[PDB]
Ligand SMILES: NCCCC[C@H](NS(N)(=O)=O)C(=O)O
Ligand SMILES: [Zn+2]
Ligand SMILES: [Zn+2]
Ligand SMILES: [Zn+2]
């Protein structure tokens with residue numbers, strides 16, 4: 001039984017991706033962009049009213065297994081699109097002019113493991129040579145300043161970069177999709193938790209992006225829009241500056257592919273519950289995040305390239 005106000009297991013999310021597509025065929029199409037290490041299908045939802053030469057925004061959730069609110073947000077975004085299309089001016093304009101490539105759960109194997117064995121699991125579930133230690137951090141596995149300071153060469157570590165850039169089938173599947181659709185993808189959004197942050201490149205090195213002033217002003221405004229609903233306080237800025245060095249990230253990789261608007265959203269909370277954010281907070285977290293996402297979406301539409 002699926003619920004947008006509850007954390008759903010992979011079996012439930014998978015059945016939901018099929019159901020939401022069948023219930024809304026004129027607004028959603030579903031494809032498998034590859035398979036995980038354990039052979040699970042990596043589903044991707046193309047959300048929007050079909051049309052020729054449409055620009056797109058890519059958004060992923062569940063890169064890190066324990067960040068259950070991120071998986072919940074991708075489902076809420078799709079919920080919003082199907083419920084408010086034709087009922088709300090902005091969402092109607094967004095789905096007519098843009099397509100949203102929503103990847104609800106990238107690290108499916110890790111997510112299954114948080115539900116079955118270890119709630120605090122972060123990485124993939126792939127094996128490593130010369131150790132019984134499992135998994136690679138997908139957010140340290142992209143080919144952008146890969147395995148430098150901020151990523152670990154130790155397979156037993158939470159920030160393990162992997163054997164090579166894109167060693168993970170999940171990472172390769174995401175990277176291959178973006179590369180195959182580079183001409184249409186105008187924005188990249190990666191949903192994570194926690195610490196209430198809106199981060200933009202760079203994280204692989206201490207350097208500011210070409211459009212730093214633009215990204216700083218956009219993140220500032222997105223943070224402001226999010227705060228209007230419940231007064232939730234978000235901080236923002238370049239990754240290495242506001243957070244820490246985190247090389248091999250999807251956001252930095254997407255940015256270096258030419259995707260000018262690249263953001264990582266760290267959702268609720270600030271540490272009280274951490275990754276174990278209660279279900280009672282899903283609605284509030286998702287609704288306020290919607291305001292920041294819609295603001296970024298509206299900006300991208302007014303600044304197409
Ligand atoms: N691509 C830069 C994103 C950095 C933040 C992210 N934070 S988290 N969700 O706590 O793991 C991470 O360390 O991968
Ligand atoms: Zn308006
Ligand atoms: Zn994360
Ligand atoms: Zn910070």
Ligand SMILES: [Zn+2]
Nearest residue numbers: 080286287290
């Ligand atoms: Zn709503």
Ligand SMILES: [Zn+2]
Nearest residue numbers: 214299302303
């Ligand atoms: Zn402008």
